[PDB]
Design a protein around this ligand. Sequence first.
Ligand code: NAG
Lengths: 35, 49
Amino acid sequence: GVYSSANNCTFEYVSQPFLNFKNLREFVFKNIDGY
Amino acid sequence: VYAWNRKRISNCVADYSVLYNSASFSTFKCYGVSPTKLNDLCFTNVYAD
Ligand SMILES: *[C@@H]1O[C@H](CO)[C@@H](O)[C@H](O)[C@H]1NC(C)=O
């Protein structure tokens, strides 16, 4: 349960899965020049 | 024609030479761009009606 509707799509991309505490996951998200 | 299908084409490589070199099309009239340079240019989205 995360959304109720999806009306106008512009981009879809399906890829391979990225994934005591045993795992450390670091991510960096950047928005530069529309990238 | 009243309910014409619109398909949005994105995130892929569009090979226009296959369409241009086909002899199966009676009309291939391009407005605003030429067929020769279509295979080189890049566009944000393609609307196929
Ligand atoms: C966005 O969606 C609404 C309803 O789902 C529609 O009326 C509108 O034309 C759409 N706009 C675009 C740019 O797709």
